[PDB]
Ligand binder design. Sequence first.
Ligand code: SF4
Ligand code: SF4
Ligand SMILES: [Zn+2]
Lengths: 159, 96, 49, 209, 115, 176, 95, 115, 45
Amino acid sequence: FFWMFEEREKMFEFYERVSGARMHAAYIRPGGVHQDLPLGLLDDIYEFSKNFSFRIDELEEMLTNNRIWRNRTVDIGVVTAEDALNYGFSGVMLRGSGIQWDLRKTQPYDVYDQVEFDVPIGSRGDCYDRYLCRVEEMRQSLRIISQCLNKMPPGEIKV
Amino acid sequence: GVRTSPTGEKVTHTGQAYDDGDYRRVRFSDRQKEVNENFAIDLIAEQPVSEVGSRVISCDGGGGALGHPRVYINLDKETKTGTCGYCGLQFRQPHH
Amino acid sequence: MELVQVLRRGLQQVSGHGGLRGYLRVLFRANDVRVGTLVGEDKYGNKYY
Amino acid sequence: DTRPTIRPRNDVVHKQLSAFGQYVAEILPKYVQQVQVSCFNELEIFIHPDGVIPVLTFLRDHTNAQFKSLADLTAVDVPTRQNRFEIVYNLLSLRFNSQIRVKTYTDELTPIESSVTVYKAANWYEREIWDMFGVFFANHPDLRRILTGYGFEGHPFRKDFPLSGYVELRYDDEVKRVVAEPVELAQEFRKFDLNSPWEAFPAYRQPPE
Amino acid sequence: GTSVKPIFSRDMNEAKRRVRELYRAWYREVPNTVHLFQLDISVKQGRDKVREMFMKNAHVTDPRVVDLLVIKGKMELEETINVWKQRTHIMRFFHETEAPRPTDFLSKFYVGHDP
Amino acid sequence: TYKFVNMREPSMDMKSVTDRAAQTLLWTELVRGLGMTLSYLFREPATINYPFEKGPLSPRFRGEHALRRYPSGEERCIACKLCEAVCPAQAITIEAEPRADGSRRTTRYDIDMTKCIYCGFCQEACPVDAIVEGPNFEFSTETHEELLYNKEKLLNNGDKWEAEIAANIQADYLYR
Amino acid sequence: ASATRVIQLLRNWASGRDLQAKLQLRYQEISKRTQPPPKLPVGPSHKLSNNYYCTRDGRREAMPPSIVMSSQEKKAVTPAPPIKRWELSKDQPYL
Amino acid sequence: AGLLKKTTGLVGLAVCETPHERLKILYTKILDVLGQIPKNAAYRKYTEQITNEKLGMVKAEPDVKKLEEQLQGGQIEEVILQAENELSLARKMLRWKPWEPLVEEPPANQWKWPI
Amino acid sequence: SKVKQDMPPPGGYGPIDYKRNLPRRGLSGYSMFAVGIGTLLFGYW
Ligand code: SF4
Ligand code: SF4
Ligand SMILES: [Zn+2]
């Protein structure tokens, strides 16, 4: 909780530095974002992204291979892949069960298509598979962050 | 300027002042009626009348983009002083 | 030798905070032990470190 | 390019969706009334209420249709039309990834058959409509109120229902409990008069009479 | 136009039947909801509230409307029976904190502008 | 593209089974986490000494609303009521009037802080940068009436947090 | 809120890594908070010529939903061509 | 099939070790059910077309891996699952009978949406 | 003056690790059992 919540506070700092409030940005408006980022924001994002994986794996080692984290969570409440999609389940809930579906790739809104990334696809459809999918989504998120950070073009902020 | 009410309350720049009976004054006992002393009515009057010598004068309120939108007041009427509606500085021809 | 070095620094901060009285006052009132450069002083009486 | 601000136009998806619209119109002429595809490549199918179960099943089961995901289920109250309430079913395909929308109409009283069986996700969505628009659903497994407070009244999303509701609740020491009282605002909602009296879009002008 | 679709009941008689055992359930319920919810309501003054609410919608004559009131009372019955409802909501029918409202025109004129 | 997350099935040689039996019996991953948390124990504690030290902020920070004024001292608000028409929570109320001098200032300008949702829409709506949100967040009050601000209270806020707002605007007007 | 080498080696061995490369802390490497005034760029339609809004409006260039079939030998057509199969992860196919 | 694939990848269904005969029997059954369906119905034409095409390709190519490739339906397990669903659909709307003309027109302007 | 804003450095940015670099540490299971049994045996002696 607390170890990653310090990093969440670091995220809140960026939220504050771009929009003006650490939680409720009101940033992304119709016709593009409200206003440009402050100078130096990209560098701080770069440092945080450098430092984040070394604690993502740190959380993993505490939870992933632990006996009682798995035992309380592994193969409890299976959800069938067929019965998942009829139930209107979405997101990792689908990906945990095993359907290869993700709106970021199949129906790429904005510039998600130009961004290269793999999705974590579940194996047993249980609680533990979904948790691992969330963590692998953390890591692929870091890779996506690197890609967008390296290739931001020059242009206006609103239409 | 801020002046005291007959009861004793400090009148506001809008002219608000609770009257004699005016049961809604218990709010101020054991407290204070917050009034701002820097009255905008008089803090603009003592400013000097600018004597710029041209027919039509631009005014943004100072600070460029930080001021008010640029308005072109007309320094035509000889019997009075033109003023920007936003800020309020009085502009006048230098006695023609 | 960093252990005796940090011991020396811990005994140095007790001298930096105006001796024992100032150090104890700072510890009890501000919950702080370290000493920083005085970057300024306001009119109301607050030291900025 | 020449149009850097205007959104890109994808006519291929438009033609292909129109072809599938003609397909589905021919397959089920009993319930389908009017199919059309929007400019932004989103197809909508206007069906008769009796086709809530059949059409959906055909969209859920058919090999060449293959829609098994209930994205959402919604009602849109509009008091003007004779049957005020209109229900929208949003389906997403997996094998043939795409979004389809089927729309039906009902008034306050005429019930509309509950899907549930075609899409077991509809259930809770279904309840919402009943608890939010008054549209009762025939043989729904449990059509109890879902969202609003206990012992509520009316159906708030009805456009006649006031913004502030009818009754608030607050502590009363005289009875030592939270009690419900008729509405008495401390400051009334100011209803601004937007929608300037000048025509915006000549394309969507209503024909005269 | 005049022809319409029913919900359950075909004619006034069968909807009249449904309200019958709805009142049956409310009667058999009132005492043990007084007991269970620790109500300050009394048994008789519990039953008469049910009777007055049933008499409140006396003017209804359309069948479909009667099915609607009966199914809404059915939802009310489920909400009460399995303790999903709370004591305050049960009291909500009884208007305690609500001050008495005058009825005569003269009192209306004395109070303020209202029809 | 995609990656399978958990298909790494184990082998069954003597070495692998001995290792797994040791890990299950001689608790190892347990000890792994037990030692990681130890590493975090000896680390430098992340903690800011409030109120002696405050959290980092940005010049765009949205906080207490305030009514600024021109360098001449005249209030910038010309009561266009744009901010009232913008506030999604309708927390702003203005009554205007032709002043004794004439400039159309607000007879009443109150912001209901308990209705306000602190969005910064009013300042970006203001065409004279009259209404703004100061960097202050230290106005937690005791009575509900204390939160409901008045025109005089807003003017006092703009006259107390003024060097702050001027400096922040000077460092932010280019972005906006 | 760096430490002693004796503790530095203890935490690294217990954590089984070289954490000095990057700590959860953030030292002087942060971006300066007094950046120079940025000169923001402009958009495409900033020229003073051939910027007629008639050839640039997006809202005005929106037609009503195209009616296909109304109540007033073609083969079988699918809503979309069947979606292909994604590729395995080249980097880490299996975690 | 060589080594039969262990898991299809979707936990909602298992592997069919003999898929070709399953495709054959389900396709033949649904072709029978469409033979029930009257000739004039467009549903019978479209579904008989796609199904006889599918049966032709499945009986032509006997390699399962290429069967999925030219079947563009992923793993053969979800293909026979979809075939069962198609059978079910045809059977279920055999008596729904949608080939008839529209039940009735919508009432006046029930679809125009500028209000 | 030329237009400037928050931009990546011209050399882009340094690589950002995302692969799970969970470390591997520990003796062989045979070694662990052997050392436990040896400590036991010394204790019993
Ligand atoms: S931030 Fe200002 S404009 Fe926005 S809702 Fe709050 S008071 Fe109104
Ligand atoms: S937008 Fe600014 S000038 Fe207009 S009424 Fe509000 S505070 Fe006054
Ligand atoms: Zn001016």
